[PDB]
Amino acid sequence: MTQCPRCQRNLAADEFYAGSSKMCKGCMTWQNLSYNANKEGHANTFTKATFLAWYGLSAQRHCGYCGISEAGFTSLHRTNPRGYHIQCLGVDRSDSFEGYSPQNARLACFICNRIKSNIFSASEMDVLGEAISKAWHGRGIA
Template sequence: MMNEMKKFLFEAAMGYDYCKSCHKGSTMEEMLSEYGLSYQKYLPEITRIQRLCTYNENGNKKIRFGNKKDFLEWYLKKWSLDGSAVCEYCGISEKECNELLNTQRKPTRGRHLEVERREPNLDYDSTNCILACYVCNNTKSDFMSEEEFRVLIPGIQAFWKSQRNKKKQN
């Protein structure tokens, strides 16, 4: 089921309005309803993944990884529907990060692992990008290399531990 959902999200994010992988010519809504799922429930996730494919730089849209298909294949291999994917720097899961992070920007940032460039002066591609939590991505920003950032990771892990303890006390 999980692989089927990832195929669905890939095809929907690519902009297909029918399910290519089922070979029945079903619409995305029909395909999901076969599993007892609602297209409307997954529409925000599809939209979010579509937005990840592009970014604005001086008002110009550019495709990450050279093309949308390559990016989506990379992203959907790394990311998980159930929130179990982890930050490749500090190790916190997307689900736990979402539960523990308290930010005013939460509707747009912090709910999901973010695409992070290990070396900020290099391109977005499969060899330079990882998924990172909001805290690691913001802390590292685009002025530190991965090597320079590594010294800060124990502090971020301590931060997440303190957030877990606060949650247990409440």
């Protein structure tokens, strides 16, 4: 129910981080996507507006490989490369040879994203995802 000072959207608490960040998850994920694309030499055909509509809202976000919810993934307490608790789902370039685009983008948790790496196709990763989903369901996580 707070407004994000970056996108100006009116949003629930679950669209924000638990730490000292003032940006919403959509804005921070968009910033990362942009910086990452340029750093790695990947094209980016999303605009911020299309990305934000694509990214939707926290309670609707689930990893497209293992099915874990954003809240479920948050409860794993995974850390990012700077050492902070990961609290949102990221974006997989389905075809790892292609860039970020509406057609090539798939929502993915950081565990599945790193697993898939540039080793497995999306099709192959669909299969790994079901196996990962069984680990979560085995731990009591949705």
